[model samples]
Target: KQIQEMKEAFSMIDVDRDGFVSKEDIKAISEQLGRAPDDKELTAMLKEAPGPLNFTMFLSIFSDKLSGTDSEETIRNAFAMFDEQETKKLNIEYIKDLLENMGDNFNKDEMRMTFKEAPVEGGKFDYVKFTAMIKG
Candidate 1:
């Protein structure tokens, strides 16, 4: 399932519809978006992709990208989006959305029960405890 999803995402970046992804494709995207990628940075990114990168190879690279630094902050930012009101707390429904986005599909009952032991207050889930729970 994960691999299938990765394939879809890889296709989006593969823009040219070619079997491989290269530095050019990435550079084209950066240019289209208004900020041109520097040759040095592009070279480094190309190293990660290597020669004639395919979905399988890109999957490995993608995994590493997802697990890269500032992971805690990344998770927190995602949570913040669902937070809506900047309350630092997400209600059960929003928490459900977060879980779904992270590739976990849990029924409301399951989520509620899971939060039963966490730091939720008045049915509002705490992002800090939730992050720790997911990390652990």
Candidate 2:
């Protein structure tokens, strides 16, 4: 299920089930009842959220392969989104967690391949170097 499912679950009110599913009372999971989902939302999500499966990206890639790849700048900004402190750095294991549960199941080699750029130095994750590997 996508992020859309959990937004209004555990008793969606407003029986009519129109565009407005008044899950209005903020609950444990505050899934915003934003505008109905669409392709535009999906693309933004692809860039904003971390750890997209290859399949999720495939839709993006093939949708307009003949045109242009997502800009490298946007891609790097996205890679940096993983930075927990906004310092362009992160700890390795936490970097490894969401990726395991939500995104690609990168094998050891694959993980090494990513970090092959020597993303870490003196035990600090540097998005500066990581983005170079991704875009360079």
Candidate 3:
């Protein structure tokens, strides 16, 4: 199950379709977006796995989500944590924090796409739909 999803993600990241996702691929995409990662950030990214990343290494990069280390119930608990007021929803700030905490460097457009998928109205997100998105 996860292998298929991971392979799709790798295909996107592996811009050249060379069976490897290297720093150059990331850098190229980042550069096109006008926000190339700095050396520190690049170094941190590379440190995640050795050499050019293969499919297995790519899976390891998102192991927390892909490995089922955190079950649906666990994720629900996390959503509750963000919904301190028990509103059964989360604000954009909480969403931002959660994504950043996961260490993915999303650009403005990507972030907007994710938030848009949350169906936020008046600055709040529906936890149920949000969880469904995460799970799927």
Candidate 4:
């Protein structure tokens, strides 16, 4: 139930439903969550490089481009760990290592910042906190 809520909250922010959230969606969600984004940079990035694109998309494309194959499990496992750091919230570093360890053929910095920015200190991963963070 709690897990589902967390997933649902993320899904809500996924606006376009492309399986991943873009910087635009992230910025919007972040603002609602009380975090601010660089509006000018976001606008430029959106105008220059728009969706059908996102962190997961980047990982998928990078994997296929680098290794000539799809790796859904690779990205899934990475995301599952994103809000579960310390066996609680996910850690980007752990995700990075997981991808590399899985022969994903992607660069270290290629993954999305969400994995790094998802949690607050001593954070507890629950639907309430998850929704609150994304909704304010």
For TM-score, the strongest prediction is 3
Candidate 2 residues 1-136, lDDT tens each? 4324433442353233443322232221234454444555445634542453233443344444436556667866786787656787777667766555566677777766766665676677776766666554
Model 1 segments beyond 4 Å from truth? 65-125, 128-136
Off by over 4 Å in 4: 1-10, 16-23, 43-51, 58-136
Cα deviation of 33, candidate 4, in Å: 0.7
Residues 108-130 of candidate 1 have per-residue lDDT tens digits of: 68766876776767878798677
Write down the lDDT that model 3 would get. Answer: 0.76
| RMSD, one per candidate, in order | 13.3, 16.5, 8.0, 12.5
lDDT of 4 by residue, 1-136 (tens): 6445656766877776776667768687677777666978666645543355554454454445456543454434444555544353544355456655567555545544434544544433332343345343
Please list all clashing residue pairs in model 3, or write none if there are none.
Answer: none
Question: What C-alpha lDDT does candidate 2 achieve relative to the native structure?
Answer: 0.53
Residues 1-136 of candidate 3: C-alpha lDDT, one tens digit per residue: 8678778868877888898877787887778678899877877988888656887777777775456455667788877886778888888777777775566767777877776667678887777677877776
Model 1 residue 84 distance off true place after TM-score fit, in angstroms:
26
Total residue pair clashes for candidate 4: 9
Clashes per candidate, residues 3 or more apart or on different chains: 0, 0, 0, 9
Report how far off residue 121 is in candidate 3 (Å).
6.3
Task: Give Cα distance to truth, residue 113, candidate 4, Å.
Answer: 18
TM per model? 0.46, 0.42, 0.51, 0.26
Q: Which candidate is the best by lDDT?
A: 3
